[PDB]
Write a protein that binds this ligand. Structure first.
Ligand SMILES: *[Se]c1ccccc1C(=O)NCc1cccnc1
Ligand SMILES: *[Se]c1ccccc1C(=O)NCc1cccnc1
Ligand SMILES: [Zn+2]
Ligand SMILES: [Zn+2]
Ligand SMILES: [Zn+2]
Ligand SMILES: [Zn+2]
Lengths: 153, 153
């Protein structure tokens, strides 16, 4: 009953459409869509704090972290709201995304509307990499494609 | 105290950066920035309902109109929330945008975050064009560039 969408663009072309839908404010958000143009393997997948793409994906800032937690994987209690783990691209460079998440929302202070979705160069280590950056960014590397998360029909 | 931003891109050469700032939730919104690649003269400038760029600026849908009014200019009582009038491009195709508007908001009710800002081919006649479409769209023609309005730092 609330639906939101994000078109991801960057060089390659890396390009994708990701849809989000939440039946009720207390419920999980289903996330689905496709990203093409990726290298085979894992790519970090995060909601970043700013829906600012004025100078490309760099202006999106850090992970969306309204509750001031450390970086983790989607299944972790200790995670940022924006920590959606990794998407996995096949040999053909396509990641078909199908996620349900209970921490992001389309309502309230966990809401991701107006933020940026980013797909990264490398895997997110989900805070298990053993360095300073692991519990901040997951060491997922450069931002390959991004877009602002908007209200859908 | 609330800042939001929008990068305008489209099928052609029209591209722009628009900033919105609102000191207080009950107060006016300052809109500023620049758009380039335009024909000299007036170009309609609207917030459209959906932050959806799936198939380009067309997927943004109609003017953002939560209060079910007819189309008008920004200084009119009878207007859509998204009716921000025209921007004006100079001889070099650059429109320097400077708008203060009392009807849009960046918080509270009916805010523009996660919606789409669109710059149009033709002038918006501000509901004074003398045909039915004037009171709906303003006869401002095709969508040259658009972007989802996102939260800024
Ligand atoms: Se959820 C959220 C986050 C940031 C800014 C605005 C919102 C919001 O809730 N907008 C109202 C809305 C959301 C979805 C569909 N229709 C209206
Ligand atoms: Se901006 C806006 C317009 C209409 C409805 C909801 C919102 C909104 O901003 N909601 C998200 C939110 C609510 C409370 C605290 N933080 C974010
Ligand atoms: Zn990231
Ligand atoms: Zn994180
Ligand atoms: Zn329009
Ligand atoms: Zn209108």
């Amino acid at each position: 009953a609330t639906k939101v969408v994000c078109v991801l663009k960057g060089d390659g072309p890396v390009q994708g459409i990701i849809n989000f839908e939440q039946k009720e404010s207390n419920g999980p958000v289903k996330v689905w869509g496709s990203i093409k143009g990726l290298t085979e393997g894992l790519h970090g997948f995060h909601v970043h704090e700013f829906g600012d793409n004025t100078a490309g994906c760099t202006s999106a800032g850090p992970h969306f972290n309204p509750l001031s937690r450390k970086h983790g994987g989607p299944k972790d209690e200790e995670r940022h709201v924006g920590d959606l783990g990794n998407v996995t691209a096949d040999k053909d460079g396509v990641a078909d995304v199908s996620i349900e998440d209970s921490v992001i929302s389309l309502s309230g202070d966990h809401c991701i509307i107006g933020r940026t979705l980013v797909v990264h160069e490398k895997a997110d280590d989900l805070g298990k990499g053993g360095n300073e950056e692991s519990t901040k960014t997951g060491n997922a590397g450069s931002r390959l494609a991004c877009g602002v998360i908007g209200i859908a029909q």
